[PDB]
Amino acid sequence: NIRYKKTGDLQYTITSHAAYSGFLEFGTRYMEAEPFMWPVYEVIRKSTVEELKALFE
C-alpha cells in the first residue's frame, strides 16, 4: 500500500495508505519506532537536488 501520484503540476506526492503505518513510523504508547519513510527522505532529497543540478550544469 505504498503508492505515489502526480497530485499537481511539477508536484508528486508519495503516500503510505495503510492505516496503522503512522504507528510504525512514529512508534506508540507500547512500541518502539521503526521509521521507514524518513530514511528514504534522506536519500531522495540528495538524488533530486543533484539531478536537477545536472540538468543545468
Partner 1 sequence: MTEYKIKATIEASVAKFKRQIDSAVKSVQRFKRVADQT
Contact residues toward partner 1 (CB under 8 A) are 7-8, 10-23, 25-26, 37-38, 40-41, 44-45, 48-49, 52-53, 56
| 3 touches DNA by CB under 7 A | no
| 37 touches DNA by CB under 7 A | no
Instruction: Give the position of cell 508519495.
Output: 14
Q: DSSP class of residue 31? A: S
- Answer for the pair 23, 31: CB distance below 8 angstroms, yes or no: yes
| 28 touches DNA by CB under 7 A | yes
Q: Give CA–CA dist 1/7, Å, rounded.
A: 17
Q: Which residues bind DNA (CB under 7 A)?
A: 18, 20, 23-24, 28-31, 34
